[PDB]
């Protein structure tokens, strides 16, 4: 039951430094090689580096050989990545990954991956999103299904999380990938389909969360009155 949980992501200033960490469980951490990988917007995966069990062997992607430092603490089942001299090119999702290292069979696989921690390098300030309702353009009388949602716009940086009815409603939900508007602010939509006949009886609330700005919003979406 391998678990890799990253933390330390967020908004950073160009030229600054940042330290990401990773908690591991479900396996004998002390016996495995660990790896960091990142993925920038519109790009593929990029290997950052690795570190063997006893920390005596550490390999880096040529470029970052000296702007990144990888370390680990076996006693605390933790992996660390120190980023420095940050530039916009460093904005990306950083992943904590386990490497199954078998020199006998010359078998090397990045088997388990964490879900990543987001990092954004910019001189701009954080901003909470405004949450607007996408009202059901249907009446509880029309019968059938109806579509409704939430418009989460003008926030920075990524990401925001969206859930409906504190997680109770997950079927038929579609949360779209955020888009970068010209203003330099992000925006996204989350929609869900519910029975028309439940409109007026069932409460639909979208829970928006934006950590970078410690913003939490719960907007109730109802059919606009005429």
């Amino acid at each position: 039951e391998v678990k890799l949980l990253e933390s330390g992501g967020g908004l950073a200033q160009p030229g600054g430094s940042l330290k990401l960490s990773c908690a591991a469980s479900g396996f004998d951490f002390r016996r495995y090689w660990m790896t960091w990988v990142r993925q920038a917007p519109g790009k593929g995966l990029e290997w950052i580096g690795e570190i063997n069990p006893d920390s005596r062997t550490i390999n880096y992607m040529p470029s970052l050989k000296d702007k990144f430092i990888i370390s680990r603490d076996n006693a605390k089942n933790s992996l660390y990545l120190q980023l420095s001299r940050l530039r916009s090119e460093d904005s990306a999702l950083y992943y904590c990954v386990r490497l199954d290292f078998d020199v006998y069979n010359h078998y090397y696989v990045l088997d388990y991956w964490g879900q990543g921690t987001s990092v954004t390098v910019s001189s701009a300030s954080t901003k909470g999103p405004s949450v607007f309702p996408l009202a059901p353009s249907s009446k509880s009388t029309s019968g059938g299904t109806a579509a409704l949602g939430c418009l989460v716009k003008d926030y920075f940086p990524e990401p925001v999380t969206v859930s409906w009815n504190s997680g109770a409603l997950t079927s038929g939900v579609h949360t779209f990938p955020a888009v970068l508007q010209s203003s330099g602010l992000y925006s996204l939509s989350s929609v869900v389909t519910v029975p028309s006949s439940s409109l007026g009886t069932q409460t639909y609330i979208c829970n928006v969360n934006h950590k970078p700005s410690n913003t939490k919003v719960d907007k109730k979406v109802e059919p606009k009155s005429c």
Partner: protein, 216 residues
């Protein structure tokens, strides 16, 4: 500068056999490159599939296999299933560092599904901000190729809309798309008919959803 290349997208039918390739810009891919493959499922969920060019990782169905074909490393999937829809990444060891390929999006063919279209007028709360966002939703369709045209009082819009598309759905293999038309409260108030016209293989003729500003 080692560059690893993969085809950007491939489509196969259920039950069919498909092969994804991985090529090195420095020459033929060899055993010392220890080609490895990673699968990416929606929500950034990655899993290692193949190691050492042709060795399956534990828990990986035998329908997946790797090998060297020509000068490239390859991943072959036999009897493709809808659960195989994902993005596959290849990676080669380059003596002292690893290099990933750009990834290949594997789509599994399924029957055509026309989208359910919905249009959403901007809320009054947002209007107070001086901006107006009009949203159009295209729900659960296939294939992905879809055209969305905005019309304001019958005038085709351009440069003022952005769209987003979800990843192929794990269950029904469909896509969902959202188009957002952004206007200033000023311009928004200067017009009456806001329409979203959709063209898709599953529609004999384009579908239009609209509303008149103010009407309710």
């Amino acid at each position: 500068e080692l560059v690893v290349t993969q085809e950007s997208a491939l489509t196969t039918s259920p039950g069919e056999t498909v092969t994804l390739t991985c090529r090195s810009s420095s020459g033929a891919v060899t055993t010392s490159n220890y080609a490895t493959w990673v699968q990416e499922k929606p929500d950034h969920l990655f899993t290692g599939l193949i190691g050492g060019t042709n060795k399956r990782a534990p828990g990986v169905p035998a329908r997946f296999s790797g090998s060297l074909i020509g000068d490239r490393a390859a991943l072959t999937i036999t009897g493709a299933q809808t659960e195989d829809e994902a993005i596959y990444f290849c990676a080669l060891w380059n003596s002292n560092h690893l290099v990933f390929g750009g990834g290949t999006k594997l789509e599994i063919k399924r029957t055509v599904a026309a989208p359910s279209v919905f249009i959403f007028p901007p809320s009054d709360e947002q209007l107070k901000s001086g901006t107006a966002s009009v949203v159009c939703l295209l729900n659960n369709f296939y294939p992905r190729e879809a055209k969305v045209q905005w019309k304001v009082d019958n005038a085709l819009q351009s440069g003022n809309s952005q769209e987003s598309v979800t990843e192929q759905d794990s269950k029904d293999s469909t896509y969902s798309l959202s188009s957002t038309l952004t206007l200033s409260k000023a311009d928004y108030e200067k017009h009456k008919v806001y329409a979203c016209e959709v063209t898709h293989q599953g529609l004999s003729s384009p579908v239009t959803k609209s509303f008149n500003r103010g009407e309710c």
